[PDB]
Amino acid sequence: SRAPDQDEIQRLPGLAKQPSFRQYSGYLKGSGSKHLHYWFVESQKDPENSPVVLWLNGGPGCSSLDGLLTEHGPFLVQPDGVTLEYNPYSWNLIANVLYLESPAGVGFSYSDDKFYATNDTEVAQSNFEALQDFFRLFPEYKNNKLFLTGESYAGIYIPTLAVLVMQDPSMNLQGLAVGNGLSSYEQNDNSLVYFAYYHGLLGNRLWSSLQTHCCSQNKCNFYDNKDLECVTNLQEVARIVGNSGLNIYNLYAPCAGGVPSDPPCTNTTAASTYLNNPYVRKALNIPEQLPQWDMCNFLVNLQYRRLYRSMNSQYLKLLSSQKYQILLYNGDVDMACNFMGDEWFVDSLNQKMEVQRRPWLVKYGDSGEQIAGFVKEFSHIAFLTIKGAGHMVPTDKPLAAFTMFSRFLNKQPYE
Amino acid sequence: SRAPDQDEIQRLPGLAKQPSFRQYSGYLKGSGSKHLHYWFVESQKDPENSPVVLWLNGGPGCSSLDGLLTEHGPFLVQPDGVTLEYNPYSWNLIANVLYLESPAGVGFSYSDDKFYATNDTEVAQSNFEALQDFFRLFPEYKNNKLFLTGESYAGIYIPTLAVLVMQDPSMNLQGLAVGNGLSSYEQNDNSLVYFAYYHGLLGNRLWSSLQTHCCSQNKCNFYDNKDLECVTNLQEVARIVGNSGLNIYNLYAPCAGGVPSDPPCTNTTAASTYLNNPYVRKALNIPEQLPQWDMCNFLVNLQYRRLYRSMNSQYLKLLSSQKYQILLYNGDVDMACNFMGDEWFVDSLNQKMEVQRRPWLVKYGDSGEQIAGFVKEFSHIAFLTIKGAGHMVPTDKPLAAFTMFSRFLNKQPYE
Ligand SMILES: *[C@@H]1O[C@H](CO)[C@@H](O[C@@H]2O[C@H](CO)[C@@H](O)[C@H](O)[C@H]2NC(C)=O)[C@H](O)[C@H]1NC(C)=O
Ligand SMILES: *[C@@H]1O[C@H](CO)[C@@H](O[C@@H]2O[C@H](CO)[C@@H](O)[C@H](O)[C@H]2NC(C)=O)[C@H](O)[C@H]1NC(C)=O
Ligand SMILES: *[C@@H]1O[C@H](CO)[C@@H](O[C@@H]2O[C@H](CO)[C@@H](O)[C@H](O)[C@H]2NC(C)=O)[C@H](O)[C@H]1NC(C)=O
Ligand SMILES: *[C@@H]1O[C@H](CO)[C@@H](O[C@@H]2O[C@H](CO)[C@@H](O)[C@H](O)[C@H]2NC(C)=O)[C@H](O)[C@H]1NC(C)=O
């Protein structure tokens, strides 16, 4: 219709059945000379009236296409790195999902000058301009309910972008959701040390040393403590947590490649094998001159200048209007952006209409209703845990993730 | 040979292949008129020289046959409650395992007077007499290395029995192992509250209420606190933990039967269907007049008089001789007898030759070496966690459980 015909995905390799929905792959113009690769998957049910949902993966420097192919896209890449299988828990069953590779240099995204050194403020402005370009390319979606969603470092990307979107009346912003998100370095660092001890990863001798060198009375500082022995003890905590063979993204999952002598314990071979196939790149309208696809761009991460230490001000600004529904959800077995840091963060916002913490349920067919996690609700904001899920909630618990997503989009209770 | 021919298991129903090892099912004489049902499975490799391992399940009132058929026996009951499949991680691959239904009234065990009201001291003495009877019936096993092992409430059964066995020079006692064991009510109750908060089951409002009503400075009393509001808050913790739809035996597992409107969240139908088959009872030499088999005898539990509050004195008595190797192992996702309570307990014994806490590894074939948990070692005693396992460690992590068991029997490092 008004959509760009040039960006249409005709026949995607590895799919045994043709999609019932239209899908597009092309470029959105960011700031300066930045060209951000998008993959837009229309809703499987009523795309014309379904909400538009932006999805951003974190890093910084990691690809949102991993969110499509391994987390909640319409089809997921199989271990052969060739076959795609339909996802019965796809977020596009009820939404027009826009997967954006951002910032420039991530995956198939690029710049004419190839200068990928960026920062939080530049990324937010470039994402805003890319969203404006999306609405110029797909004007039929301008009035649809808009939701901004993401994972991990997108805990910074999403609220900063939402603050820019809020100032634009033409965008129908209705809410935002952040999965295992970085909301406060201080809250994340402090909660992680407690998480590690209480999940049986630190011994009583190390815990005693941490209490004596990092703490004073009933308050611990595991964030910016200057005490030299506290720093040494925290280096040991960091070694046990992420550099000893434990999977930082899911404590109870195995470490891909085994305990050492792609980030540690992960394996991105399937998605990389699929996206690096020349026929897949052609099907996705990727210019031939672009370098190989990687799940995370090491150089974007290395050159990235982190600016914000907390999203407290951003969330308070977004809640001030009382126009948006906010969700922070965390898999409770993740150690990268643990659930407690985000629960502490949401509680610290001190919002009105505080509800008692309750379990939230998911029906698992014949197995009946099961506790999928816990919900702590306030006016216009809720914090949720996903019991037994790691860093990538839709990968570990796809039915619970879809159920939560459906309740979020429809502004329904999470219970 | 010198073994009782009358107790031989000829053809066990549900097995597609005949066992390569000899197995027996009969009765051991306990104290008074008590007859304890045993199921003895000889080692699959060199039964004549392999150690004799007693296995006791807890409750009190629960059957050790559930340990055989669902945890670490040579064959495990399938969901149809008819088929038995060989267990490649069976503890009898390297040991002569004696599964004893104890005390009287549990499973197929009984008394001539049918009076099942008992206590810790009577149970220990009856188990000792039953062990003496085992050696009279199987004199060929008198000189074999003897290990006393068990789970949950057997955290009391095993050390109390071991104190009696230690006084008998004719029994070749070499060690004892307790899985997710009750070692101290105080340590278990205190650690559970911390476990619940740090696993995201209690909200900040409830945690604040618990800190104000149960704690004074840097010490919390969640065990025997007389404060009325502390009791009310702890009743809420107990409700969330075990009476709200969470599986107390494995936090990340579903609740069998679903979230409510056999103990809660468990399902013993397969083992019960199998053991209640009249041909199975005949094959196991069970007298026809005995009542139906149940996984846990509700009446034995109801009438049971708990006497010991801590196993501190028993373990110190057992360690005094320096003749026995002791192991306390806990699945770290169990909430019934959580890992922290037992780690605190082992550390509180204040033994010599304290080693730095380290991860212990298991090779998962092509997946390589993986962290199976953590080991805290002292002279003659080690505490181990089994990462991602619940209350029944061999059911949840059979390869890790076998590996740990092999290292324990052979007095090898756990790493
Ligand atoms: C990393 O992931 C790749 C991709 O899934 C794994 O390779 C696959 O291994 C299976 C089993 O051997 C094969 O059936 C697939 O055909 C392989 N796919 C590809 C693209 O080669 C690989 O084994 C994983 N590596 C580790 C260390 O976990
Ligand atoms: C974040 O990145 C932006 C974009 O590069 C920086 O802003 C530019 O800074 C240069 C050098 O001072 C100027 O020449 C440009 O005109 C600026 N552009 C804009 C849009 O302001 C910004 O300084 C960076 N922030 C930090 C703190 O490093
Ligand atoms: C409790 O356990 C029993 C025994 O495993 C379950 O019954 C089995 O269910 C499967 C699937 O429907 C059948 O294939 C088996 O033949 C059944 N076995 C028996 C002995 O009936 C039962 O579904 C479980 N109940 C709950 C609520 O989890
Ligand atoms: C634990 O159980 C034993 C066994 O029943 C109790 O000991 C018996 O107590 C009765 C009543 O006082 C005496 O008639 C028996 O002679 C005792 N038997 C033995 C072997 O001592 C014992 O009192 C119970 N302990 C507690 C604290 O209840």
From Swiss-Prot, chains A, B:
List the GO molecular function terms: carboxypeptidase activity; enzyme activator activity; serine-type carboxypeptidase activity
Q: State the disulfide connectivity.
A: 62-296, 214-230, 215-220, 255-265
Q: What is its EC number?
A: 3.4.16.5
- Carbohydrate attachment sites? 119, 267
Enzyme class, first EC level, given as a word: hydrolase
List the InterPro entries: AB_hydrolase_fold, Peptidase_S10, Ser_caboxypep_his_AS, Ser_caboxypep_ser_AS
Where it sits in the cell: the answer is: Lysosome
Give the record's disease field.
Answer: Galactosialidosis: A lysosomal storage disease associated with a combined deficiency of beta-galactosidase and neuraminidase, secondary to a defect in cathepsin A. All patients have clinical manifestations typical of a lysosomal disorder, such as coarse facies, cherry red spots, vertebral changes, foam cells in the bone marrow, and vacuolated lymphocytes. Three phenotypic subtypes are recognized. The early infantile form is associated with fetal hydrops, edema, ascites, visceromegaly, skeletal dysplasia, and early death.
Put simply, this protein is called Lysosomal protective protein
The species this protein belongs to is: Homo sapiens (Human)
Question: Lineage of the native species?
Answer: Eukaryota, Metazoa, Chordata, Craniata, Vertebrata
User: What is the gene name?
Assistant: CTSA
